[PDB]
């Protein structure tokens, strides 16, 4: 069948968790990078972006926009979304907390510089006091290797992706959560994820100053 095609900037941004999810599911995909304002204008004008924004993923005849719509579909299609309505509820609750914290971290770079130290301070405090205790509590409550249903789900993938970003930000934040460390290690050793973490995969690097400043110019934001 049609191989999924991801339209995004050549950057992590809002497409990276989709790259993680597809790669962890063992699904081949290709990428079409938006290099210029002209590239974005053309996708807009031609009608392929419902709300004039990317990420956009072509999969199974559809042109999907909205990160959560994209991820929701992929997770169902490849059975990473639980076995029933009640398991989806747990997965949804888990990954929405991950998304909330991920949104903060996602936006720290474009945070105005006079307010950036306090944004970071607050982020670190929510990690140690709100989010990391909540997932450690889940893992300790059942002691199993996966967050939900004793079976790999999107929740494990999204969580461990976030754990890598939190390491980039501050290695010490995970130090008092041994079950999160153990999750990160096990998920990273699943063959599909291990390959995704090795060089040459579609996994994207952190944004750097040159790349951010240049893209701020090209796309005026």
From Swiss-Prot:
Question: Is Isomerase tagged as a keyword?
Answer: yes
pH-linked activity: Optimum pH is 8.0 for the isomerization of androst-5-ene-3,17-dione.
Compartment(s): Cytoplasm
Domain (GST C-terminal) ranges:
84-206
The GO cellular component terms are: cytosol; extracellular exosome
Sites binding glutathione sit at 8, 44, 53-54, 66-67
Q: What is this protein called?
A: Glutathione S-transferase A1
Task: Please give the organism.
Answer: Homo sapiens (Human)
């Amino acid at each position: 069948a049609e191989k999924p095609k991801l339209h995004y900037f050549n950057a992590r941004g809002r497409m990276e968790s989709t790259r993680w999810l597809l790669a962890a599911a063992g699904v081949e995909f290709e990428e079409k990078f938006i290099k210029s304002a002209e590239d974005l204008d053309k996708l807009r004008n031609d009608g392929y972006l419902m709300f004039q924004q990317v990420p956009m993923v072509e999969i199974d005849g559809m042109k999907l926009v909205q990160t959560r719509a994209i991820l929701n579909y992929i997770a169902s299609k490849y059975n990473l979304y639980g076995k029933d309505i009640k398991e989806r509820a747990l997965i949804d609750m888990y990954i929405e907390g991950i998304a909330d914290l991920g949104e903060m971290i996602l936006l720290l770079p474009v945070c105005p510089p006079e307010e950036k130290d306090a944004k970071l301070a607050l982020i670190k405090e929510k990690i140690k006091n709100r989010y990391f205790p909540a997932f450690e509590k889940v893992l300790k409550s059942h002691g199993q290797d996966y967050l939900v249903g004793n079976k790999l789900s999107r929740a494990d993938i999204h969580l461990v992706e976030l754990l890598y970003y939190v390491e980039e930000l501050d290695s010490s934040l995970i130090s008092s959560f041994p079950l999160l460390k153990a999750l990160k290690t096990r998920i990273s050793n699943l063959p599909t994820v291990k390959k995704f973490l090795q060089p040459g995969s579609p996994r994207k690097p952190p944004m750097d100053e040159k790349s951010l400043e240049e893209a701020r110019k090209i796309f005026r934001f």
